[PDB]
Design a protein around this ligand. Structure first.
Ligand SMILES: CC(=O)N1CCC[C@H]1C(=O)N[C@@H]1COC(=O)c2cccc(-c3cccc(C(=O)O)c3)c2CSC[C@H](C(=O)N(C)C)NC1=O
Ligand SMILES: [Cl-]
Length: 285
């Protein structure tokens, strides 16, 4: 029994919701709220524990970028603060290699990070690794073949279609084949040995197109687009299918949850979140 967890998000302000969807029965569980509301965060799982990394708390009073790492234990329904990152990272990308969390790019006020840092749960420590070749906020991150890919985003001047790859044993980055579409705020994940980039913002419009990167051929190929255009969507893989949760379509904050079946190349609306929101952190455990 694995659930799709959605943490935080944004609807008029940053949210503290932690909710879990069971794809087997269509139920949503209302779990313990985050101690501090956040949007632009990312979720991940290490050893059955859920992590909420970075983001920003936007309130009608003022906004605060987060360098926080918080840990949720599904067995206790309790959040526990962990060591914070070296810098606040809003609109962050996260990836897990060998039970180590990589926090990629993101923004802190006027700053757009190229810096990347790694968290070791067993030591409760963060350490900087080699920075990316490009500054990237709203960056999609995927782990494939024990390599950490940074896909698209925004370098502070332009939205990007470029993508790069990190070699943890060598501690270095290399640019890979760029996507067909410029995407900032896309949902990036790996399914069946392919990296998928769904939705995002091309600098003018929110996207519904979805493309996948094949490593053997080094080519990005378009697959069936989602029914709803969305940027700042949450994304995860569950039982061989991609799930996209919420997002922003340019006017409204989506509650729509779509599911991609790779065997039939089709998307379908599987459920709706309890309320519309963008900038959620998603993970499965
Ligand atoms: C103008 C603006 O962005 N805002 C002013 C008040 C605070 C802030 C505000 O509304 N943010 C909330 C939160 O959104 C995310 O968490 C979030 C999380 C991850 C990625 C992205 C993302 C997507 C596309 C491109 C880029 C890129 O970096 O180029 C980044 C976002 C921003 S989605 C845009 C939408 C918006 O602009 N309006 C006006 C509601 N913003 C949001 O949903
Ligand atoms: Cl924001």
């Amino acid at each position: 029994g694995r659930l799709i967890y959605t943490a935080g998000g944004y609807f008029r302000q940053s949210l503290s919701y932690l909710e879990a969807y069971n794809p087997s029965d269509g139920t949503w569980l209302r779990l313990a709220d985050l101690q501090v509301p956040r949007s632009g965060l990312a979720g991940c799982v290490v050893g059955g524990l859920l992590y909420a990394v970075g983001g920003r708390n936007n309130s009608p009073d003022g906004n605060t970028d987060s360098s926080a790492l918080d840990c949720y234990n599904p067995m206790t329904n309790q959040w526990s603060p962990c060591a914070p990152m070296s810098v606040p990272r809003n609109r962050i990308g996260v990836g897990v290699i060998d039970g180590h969390i990589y926090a990629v790019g993101g923004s802190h006020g006027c700053i757009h990070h190229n810096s990347v840092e790694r968290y070791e749960p067993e030591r409760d420590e963060w350490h900087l690794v080699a920075p990316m070749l490009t500054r990237r906020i709203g960056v999609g991150v995927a782990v494939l073949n024990r390599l950490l890919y940074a896909v698209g985003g925004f370098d502070g001047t332009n939205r990007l279609n470029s993508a790069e790859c990190y070699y943890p044993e060598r501690n270095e980055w290399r640019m890979i084949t760029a996507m067909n579409t410029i995407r900032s705020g896309a949902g990036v994940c790996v399914l069946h040995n392919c990296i998928y980039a769904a939705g995002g913002y091309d600098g003018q419009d929110q996207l519904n197109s979805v493309e996948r990167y094949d490593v053997a051929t080094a080519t990005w190929t378009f697959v069936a687009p989602m029914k709803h255009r969305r940027s700042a969507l949450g994304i995860t893989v569950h039982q061989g299918r991609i799930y996209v949760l919420g997002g922003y379509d340019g006017h409204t904050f989506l509650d729509s949850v779509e599911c991609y079946d790779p065997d039939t190349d089709t998307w379908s609306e599987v459920t709706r979140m309890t309320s519309g929101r963008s900038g959620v952190g998603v993970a499965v455990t």
